[PDB]
Amino acid sequence: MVKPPYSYIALITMAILQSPQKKLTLSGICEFISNRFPYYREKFPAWQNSIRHNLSLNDCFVKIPREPGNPGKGNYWTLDPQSEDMFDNGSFL
């Protein structure tokens, strides 16, 4: 059921947009996936990390492993000023 599309790079493109600024919370991402990937996560919940691998291997942002300021909910992934190609390769389609 759900017959979802098999696209990783795309899975991230949507996982990145999640942040209208420049902060992605892997915790808010995993929950964001199941939001539209129930039969996928409910079937392949072990791929939760698999996506993370391509997640940072896609854009190449910086994750904060237990930052000395937050309480302990998620992370603050920020896109590095190197690619900025996905940010707006075309312009704003």
- Report all structural domains of the chain as residue ranges with CATH numbers, in order of start: 1-93 (1.10.10.10)
CA distance 48 to 3: 18
CA distance 2 to 38: 8
Spacing of C-alpha 80 from chain mean position: 14
The DSSP code sequence of 3-40 is: -----HHHHHHHHHHT-SSS-B-HHHHHHHHHTT-HHH
Structure determination method: NMR
Partners of 83 in beta bridges = none
Q: Are 15 and 32 in contact (CB under 8 A)?
A: yes
